[PDB]
Amino acid sequence: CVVVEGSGRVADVIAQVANLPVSDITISLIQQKLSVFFQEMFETFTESRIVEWTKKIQDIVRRRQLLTVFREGKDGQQDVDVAILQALL
């Protein structure tokens, strides 16, 4: 799975927690980064939704092999192709 940086809500909150160690995720940090990007519906979040999304983001960023960020390099803004090839390999 390749995520694209500078795109939207869920993309940015996955792309920020890419290179982080797996134990360094705090459930406080999740809702902190969540409510700024979800600032339209940030107040619509409950604690059970926060712990579910924290568990899911944890179990995703564990498997570091199967994920890549596009990084939105934005100096050439080359293609999706350069990302998709490394995410294949």
Partner: protein, 89 residues
């Protein structure tokens, strides 16, 4: 230390002139009634006064020349007359 002016000035007496500064605090709710949120912390509301020739908002705090009605010395005309003693209780 030193201030640069000898004397009493516009103060009542020498040494300290004792006064009480009360503050009222409450939370700031959204349209739903939940607490509005900052980046991390929350939003707070204080009740302030503006005098006609002060051009400034300030705390309703009075000189502690009377004992218990020093908030009333700030807020007899501001708060109430009889219910003011109840809120002072």
């Amino acid at each position: 230390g030193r201030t640069g002016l000898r004397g009493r000035g516009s103060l009542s007496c020498f040494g300290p002139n004792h006064t009480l500064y009360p503050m009222v605090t409450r939370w700031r709710r959204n349209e739903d009634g939940a607490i509005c949120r900052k980046s991390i912390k929350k939003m707070l509301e204080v009740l302030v006064v503006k005098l006609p020739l002060s051009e400034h908002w300030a705390l309703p705090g009075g000189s502690r020349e009377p004992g218990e009605m020093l908030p009333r010395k700030l807020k007899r005309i501001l708060r109430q007359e009889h219910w003011p003693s109840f809120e002072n209780l």
